[PDB]
Chains A and B, each alone.
Chain A
Amino acid sequence: LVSSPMSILVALVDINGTFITNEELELEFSNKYVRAIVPDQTFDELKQMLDNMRKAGLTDIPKMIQDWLVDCSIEKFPLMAKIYSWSFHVGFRKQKMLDAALDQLKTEYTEDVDDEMYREY
């Protein structure tokens, strides 16, 4: 729940200069400027994610995300990165092997697939 918004947040920050990988750790830096293009559906998904946060009893984290959403600046993005990192420290989820496996092998196979696509693949 807490880590979900990040997948959208990265798409809301404009690039004002960036790094470019060359060979395995080597970075050449660009002054390129890129504006963040975000459709309304993505904003609806982010709203749904914050609603899910609040439905689970979260008040401070969604409020922080909403406050950051006023400007969507990279200078205040460290708080978003902080929330993202903190989400993973609530421990592991060592559920039973049966439930975890059944979740993994939960398949809905169909004969109604695109034969052309599968043959090309």
Chain B
Amino acid sequence: EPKESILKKLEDIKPEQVKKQTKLFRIFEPRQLPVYRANGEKELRNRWYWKLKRDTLPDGDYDVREYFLNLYDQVLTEMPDYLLLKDMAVENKNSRDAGKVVDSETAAICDAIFQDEETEGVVRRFIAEMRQRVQADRNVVNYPSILHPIDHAFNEYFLQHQLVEPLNNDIIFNYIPERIRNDVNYILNMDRNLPSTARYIRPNLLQDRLNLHDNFESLWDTITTSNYILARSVVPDLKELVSTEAQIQKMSQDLQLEALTIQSETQFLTGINSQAANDCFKTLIAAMLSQRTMSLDFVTTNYMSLISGMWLLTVVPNDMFIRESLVACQLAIINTIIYPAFGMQRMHYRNGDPQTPFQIAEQQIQNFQVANWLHFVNNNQFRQVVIDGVLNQVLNDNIRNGHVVNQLMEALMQLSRQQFPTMPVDYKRSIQRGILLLSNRLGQLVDLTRLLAYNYETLMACITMNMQHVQTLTTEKLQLTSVTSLCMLIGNATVIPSPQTLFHYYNVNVNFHSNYNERINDAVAIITAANRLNLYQKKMKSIVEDFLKRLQIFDISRVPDDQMYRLRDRLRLLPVEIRRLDIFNLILMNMEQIERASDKIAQGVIIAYRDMQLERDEMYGYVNIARNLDGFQQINLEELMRTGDYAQITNMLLNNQPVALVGALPFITDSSVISLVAKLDATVFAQIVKLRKVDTLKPILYKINSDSNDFYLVANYDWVPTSTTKVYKQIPQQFDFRASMHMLTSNLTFTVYSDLLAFVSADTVEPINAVAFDNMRIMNEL
């Protein structure tokens, strides 16, 4: 894609969506139901029971586990970053003190209970005593709330595990990278004193847990390309470059060019312009920052390209260049400049040789300056250093102070003094002319090396993800004519990253890192939950697709499925984030209770072949409910549906062998006494033998009480109903108003901030006086 589109994608990433809770999370609600006496007669007083607010649990145990994975997703969506309960507070109309409660749904329950005529006076007293307590000294507030125990657990976790931390000026200042603060070239200032009640959210700057730099070569190529584009966007632009026309004229005078051949010149002057110099500066710094491999493009007939390549290999570690291009450049330098200078036979270098041309030349060359420069170029490498918790690639200290430029120069000088025994005098003249052009700007070259190093390290301080040095799938093409332009046109103007540019680069890096980590956390949580919920029919490709799409720098159309499943495997070995893990632990603990609260499904059906008395349960009357599957062989309906082998269940149904079919089933609620006497519940299992399907199974639940049309049979015959089948199901829990009151505590008020560096005003010292790590000015040429 165009680089501009990639930059727009990277700079459009927001810090993180901040979630606020507006209402208490609730899975349950109170519901008033008629109750019945032990003889099945209806009472005049109803009772409040806990019921599912949205009873939508499906049929089949596997589908129930899918439902609970969806519920985990919903809870994670509703989990807030912070919480102020004053926002949820509403007036309790029956409060003695006219106090407040949270949330509005609690107030609705309070009003419904208080206004009800069947309410015990103690409950009304309790509702009258419900009010909030404010402790302004501690910035705390407590509100009464009516919550189911599971609802209370979830909301309490939300309240006690918020993500906001106190914010002050010291925190804002320390949020800046330590190396930027340590730099004496930047002055930082503030004009605000943040209040003690200010808050902020720390980004999750954990280092790469997927290690995409290892064996995810295409994804790593995309990541490195994005980093390269961002680095190019933030690298400062060269200014006060030597006038291209004036420098070209000076070079023509030095080369003693024939008149009018400046346009046609291709040995020294081709490709020299300010655009190429600026592009070289940007390419070098951006490639080093993003650790993107570079490819050298040059024409062997251009001697200036070879001398600029000598300088480039002196200053840039050679691991930054693709091997073939580096080998070609070194071979051209050796066979055009060094060996002909010393009269050595042209190197016959083998493609694929374990040694680079410079490594061979170092052994073969007797001159000490040339051999020393060759050895340094051979061994010049980055140093891996963990600085401020981030892995970085650090240049050699002699590169940072531009001292290597002297070593190279020494070699060049020794090459200018050689006789070139086997070459015509014009060849020596051409090499001397190229060396003269480069060495007329020795001070500028030292300044340029120091400037490159300083800009590199200053922008490196702003990187939050580890600088992993690994060769990339694709390269960035660097033309040696651009290096020649940079060498020949760089002035004495010091360009260093602007403080606001550094802050923007750091913020973009932080946002990308935080997005990476948060999407990793989401994917890991979903994968681990699906594994712990035994969702064996679930293909996790969608999770990885969502993860990669939310990373927002990969085009998933180019990502095959095997790579996504490798990503799944790597994510599966990572621990779950503490908040998500605890939420999932709560869901695992309470999913049985949540499922058994459903009125749409039953937990099973016990097919006995003896008369079992219907149970007395005040909210049903007489009901053929089984509280447990004790004393019955269990057939797992999920396993039966998965395997399709109906031999066992068919044999048990044909032989009238008592059994319990276990699994989320729908049931028919039949309140007819005549239906119970007719034994219809025992007639609903023949279809299993007929069709060998259990998804159609729908056991009958009897609900016998005075509301039944023929309840007189129960009343007029002192008869306790019996049935041969039972529904494995639970009875609802009574809603006790006092036991459901919890004082939710939160902070009374605070303000949350997002962009800390918006509070920092930063300026640069005069560039003429900007200093490097060695306390000397970056550029000293005049």
Residues in A lying within 8 Å of B, measured CB to CB: 16-17, 20, 22-23, 26-33
Contacts and interface: CB of A to CB of B under 8 A. Distances in A.
Nearest to B274: A22
- Secondary structure at the A interface, as helix, strand, loop or mixed, is strand
Given A22-B244, A23-B244, A26-B244, A31 B277 contact: no
A31 B7 contact: yes
Contacts of B8: 16, 33
A26 B276 CA distance: 11
Interface string B1-24: 001100110010000000000000
A64 to B, nearest CB: 24
Contacts of B245: 23
Given A23-B243, A26-B275, A28-B278, A33 B7 contact: yes
Nearest to B10: A33
Nearest to A29: B275
A28 B232 contact: no
B273 A29 contact: no
A23 B229 CA distance: 27
Given A31-B229, A32-B237, A33-B233, A17 B4 contact: yes
27 contacts: A16-B8, A17-B3, A17-B4, A17-B7, A17-B233, A22-B241, A22-B274, A22-B275, A23-B243, A23-B244, A26-B244, A26-B275, A27-B275, A28-B237, A28-B238, A28-B274, A28-B278, A29-B278, A29-B279, A30-B237, A31-B233, A31-B235, A31-B282, A32-B234, A33-B7, A33-B8, A33-B11
A102 B287 CA distance: 62
B272 to A, nearest CB: 11
Contacts of A28: 237-238, 241, 274-275, 277-279
Given A28-B275, A31-B233, A32-B234, 17 more contacts: A16-B7, A16-B8, A17-B4, A20-B237, A23-B245, A26-B273, A26-B274, A28-B241, A28-B274, A28-B277, A31-B3, A31-B229, A31-B232, A32-B237, A33-B7, A33-B11, A33-B233
Closest 8 CB pairs of A and B: A28-B278, A22-B274, A31-B232, A31-B233, A16-B4, A28-B275, A28-B274, A30-B237
A16 B5 CA distance: 9
Interface in B1-49: 3-4, 7-8, 11
Contacts of A31: 3, 7, 229, 232-233, 235, 282
Nearest to A27: B275
A108 B4 CA distance: 50
Contacts of B282: 31
Contacts of A17: 3-4, 7, 233
A27 to B, nearest CB: 6
A32 B3 CA distance: 12
Contacts of B234: 32
